[PDB]
Amino acid sequence: GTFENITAAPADPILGLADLFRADERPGKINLGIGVYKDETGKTPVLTSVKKAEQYLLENETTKNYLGIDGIPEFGRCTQELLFGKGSALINDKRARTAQTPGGTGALRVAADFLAKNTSVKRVWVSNPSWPNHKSVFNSAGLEVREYAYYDAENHTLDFDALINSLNEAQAGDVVLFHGCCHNPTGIDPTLEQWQTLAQLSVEKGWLPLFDFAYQGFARGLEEDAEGLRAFAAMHKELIVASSYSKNFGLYNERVGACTLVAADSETVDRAFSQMKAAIRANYSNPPAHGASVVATILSNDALRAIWEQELTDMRQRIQRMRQLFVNTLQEKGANRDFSFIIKQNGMFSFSGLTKEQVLRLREEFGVYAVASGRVNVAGMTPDNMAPLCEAIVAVL
Amino acid sequence: GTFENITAAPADPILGLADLFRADERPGKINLGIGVYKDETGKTPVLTSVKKAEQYLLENETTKNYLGIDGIPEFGRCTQELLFGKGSALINDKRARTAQTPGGTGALRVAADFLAKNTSVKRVWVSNPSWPNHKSVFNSAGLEVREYAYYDAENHTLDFDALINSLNEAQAGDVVLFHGCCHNPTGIDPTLEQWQTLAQLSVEKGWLPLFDFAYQGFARGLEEDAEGLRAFAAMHKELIVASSYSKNFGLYNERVGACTLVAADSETVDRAFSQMKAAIRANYSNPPAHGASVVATILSNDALRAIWEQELTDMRQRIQRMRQLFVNTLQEKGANRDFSFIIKQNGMFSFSGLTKEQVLRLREEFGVYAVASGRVNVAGMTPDNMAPLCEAIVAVL
Ligand SMILES: Cc1ncc(COP(=O)(O)O)c(C=O)c1O
Ligand SMILES: *Cc1c(COP(=O)(O)O)cnc(C)c1O
Numbered sequence A, B: 001g002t003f004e005n006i007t008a009a010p011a012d013p014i015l016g017l018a019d020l021f022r023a024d025e026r027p028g029k030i031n032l033g034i035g036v037y038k039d040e041t042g043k044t045p046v047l048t049s050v051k052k053a054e055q056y057l058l059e060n061e062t063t064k065n066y067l068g069i070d071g072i073p074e075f076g077r078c079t080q081e082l083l084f085g086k087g088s089a090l091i092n093d094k095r096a097r098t099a100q101t102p103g104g105t106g107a108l109r110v111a112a113d114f115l116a117k118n119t120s121v122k123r124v125w126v127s128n129p130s131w132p133n134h135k136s137v138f139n140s141a142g143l144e145v146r147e148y149a150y151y152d153a154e155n156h157t158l159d160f161d162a163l164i165n166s167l168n169e170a171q172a173g174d175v176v177l178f179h180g181c182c183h184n185p186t187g188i189d190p191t192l193e194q195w196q197t198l199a200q201l202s203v204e205k206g207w208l209p210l211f212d213f214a215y216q217g218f219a220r221g222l223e224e225d226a227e228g229l230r231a232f233a234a235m236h237k238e239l240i241v242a243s244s245y246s247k248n249f250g251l252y253n254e255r256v257g258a259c260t261l262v263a264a265d266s267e268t269v270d271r272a273f274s275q276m277k278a279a280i281r282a283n284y285s286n287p288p289a290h291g292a293s294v295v296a297t298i299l300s301n302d303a304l305r306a307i308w309e310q311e312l313t314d315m316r317q318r319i320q321r322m323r324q325l326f327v328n329t330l331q332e333k334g335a336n337r338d339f340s341f342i343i344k345q346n347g348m349f350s351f352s353g354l355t356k357e358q359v360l361r362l363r364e365e366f367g368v369y370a371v372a373s374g375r376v377n378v379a380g381m382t383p384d385n386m387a388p389l390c391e392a393i394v395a396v397l
Helices: A015-023 A048-060 A073-084 A103-118 A133-140 A160-167 A192-205 A227-233 A266-281 A289-300 A302-332 A340-344 A356-366 A386-396 B015-023 B048-060 B073-084 B103-118 B133-140 B160-166 B192-205 B224-233 B266-281 B289-300 B302-332 B356-366 B386-396
Strands: A096-101 A123-128 A144-149 A175-179 A208-213 A239-244 A257-262 A349-351 A375-377 B096-101 B123-128 B144-149 B175-179 B208-213 B239-244 B257-262 B349-351 B375-377
Touching: A048 A289, A048 A302, A048 B048, A073 A096, A073 A227, A073 A239, A073 A257, A073 A289, A096 A103, A096 A266, A103 A133, A103 A208, A103 A239, A103 A257, A103 A266, A123 A133, A133 A144, A133 B266, A144 A160, A160 A192, A192 A227, A208 A227, A227 A239, A257 A266, A266 B133, A289 A302, A289 B289, A302 A340, A302 A386, A356 A386, B048 B289, B048 B302, B073 B096, B073 B224, B073 B239, B073 B257, B073 B289, B096 B103, B096 B266, B103 B133, B103 B208, B103 B239, B103 B257, B103 B266, B123 B133, B133 B144, B144 B160, B192 B224, B208 B224, B224 B239, B257 B266, B289 B302, B302 B386, B356 B386
Parallel strands: A123 A144, A123 A175, A175 A208, A208 A239, B123 B144, B123 B175, B175 B208, B208 B239
Antiparallel strands: A096 A257, A239 A257, A349 A375, B096 B257, B239 B257, B349 B375
8 A cells, every 4th residue: 555654744834724714613713824915804805907907818818828838928028127127237138037937936946946956056045934835845856955044033133143154154056045025924124235245245155046036016116125136136147036926916826926047148047947947847847827927918018017016005005004003003902012123024924923822822712813933914904803903912912 | 157067958859849830931831749739720719618717707706815735626526526427436435635736747746746755656657658748757756767568550559468568567566657548649548448457457566556637538538538547446545647627628828737646545545635735835835726717617517518518529529530531631642551540549649650750851841840759730630731731741751
């Protein structure tokens, strides 16, 4: 019996939490786990720009014929402009190649498979803490995962001294993974000056930087959120960018991502990109069209794009209002601590500082669901559920 | 530099051709390469049942929130009914779990990863010839791929005696891959009693059967094409099925597939399926929704399903008509080689029996593109291009 001795797998710390929430019978449940945006009414809607783009596709698609291994060309072009800028030298020098992938996760696995099978890379450095699935993706491709310091739990800030010291151990040729913006789970991003320090330190020690870009547009703005990346881009000969449209387009279940490869010249990137296309062929062959077609349609049409940029702005601003409302309401419900640091965190998540035992008690006794690390989804908070949520947090302090 | 030591990847034997075809500048070219269906006008249209389902989705979809790791539940249920039968014992005993995957390739890759990490499987046996990407998928997981004999190139028949003898060294615990129907590229499938012999020999030797089902409904019918699988399923404790809807629904670029796990009992398959979900999570996280929603919508709605089943019949019967017309026109155009074996082969592909040198001559001398193995896509033949391409073949014989 080939399957008789298999060991059951542990639950996913994010998705395993969601199945529990769906099963909970109590009517006043609150879900602050998975990073999914909710509007004021508590729903995760389809954007108007997306619905209009889908209508265009429905009435104009003539075939479902396979896309190329790397996907829709216009999709790749628009992705590189978003990442690097309209008139970037990487683009004009033809130094960058982009493959449409199934989500940001798929972009990470493609890069990992590509590295482990075509290079001498054997080590990937990931911030501590980070998105839980990072370790799983790179380990599954056969790469070793090392951790570098990032979060100061006492000051609720970025420990730039610990980060630099920890990364001194990263040898040349290693891969160092950076969150482009809206660090998951801490919400604390480097300042532009800190980015430039890392970019200079990156070229000196010979690192291959890998950028995970899942939240472009949720910190300050589309262009503003890519400053750190464009600092590395202006200084490195090689780098990898895995990006996702799941969240800034609300296209989660359509799996829309990109893996962008940068090399010193056009000849080397095409040679390396051919091996990336080979790793894709042996995985899922070619990428799903519907989600990437929507994104390409929106970014290619100035009218649709104007709607989307405005829908994304409302998302960013609503999350900022909830951060404020969250802090004020905690003080009002009797919280003794100071939660002001939540105002300075970017993106959808906040490191609340709650212990594992408190997170566990919030779930069992109050029906409030957060990840065991104390990460809470601010974008899951509404004017309606704010008061019960804060009453439960104060009760477990 | 980390990318400068990378060696360029060779051209895909199937996709490297279609790129060389889109470049060709001659009028009247004919492409008998990629395995995509075409109607009598030479186009690959969206099925009417698919447009109807897509219209229903555009109007009723309220969210794009993530699917579960294994995808749409109803999609997995309908898949098992298609494979095993409406009232199979496998389903009632709850011995089967199905994961929605990005295409048939995605299902094969998920199985390869699952087997590599969680079992002592070290070897997959694949027919010679086979779909070229089989070796790449299983190799990507580190699995050794051995080949067994299949095609009698003299009689254009299944060499069943050589098949048996060549699998003598397949050990217990080895994986043996079978094409469920419409064998790619030969179009030669085992008979029902040949299937029965293989099922009986597979259980005595202890093989783990893995069925690749990309063409259900293109040989004889939906139920008849699954008889081989169901003969195995009635005798084996364990088996794997990778199925694809890319071709029988015309959803190529939406990447709609399924990996189905079968074990001895419900507790074992659940335990093993949890590890399969872990391998999906570390690859693309969760599957794309649009294509699978279309399939689930059609198969759950009796009105849409009757339309689709008729569109599939239309596709199947056109291919069989081109097989007849191809043989007849070859005679009309003066061929002395007997091509009657074309009529006996199932699906979209057949080995024409032309040498690599003749294939090269057809391509650069008449504008007719076929794979260098001599495989031709019969679904690429139309009443308008039949006479030109037959004139071309006769010329190089
Ligand atoms: C930092 C980070 N990387 C990658 C992902 C995965 O993106 P996707 O769901 O598009 O695969 C996420 C969360 O979804 C994330 O927060
Ligand atoms: C075409 C084909 C596949 C690929 O299926 P997709 O859904 O396109 O990924 C897999 N196996 C065989 C035998 C095929 O012919």
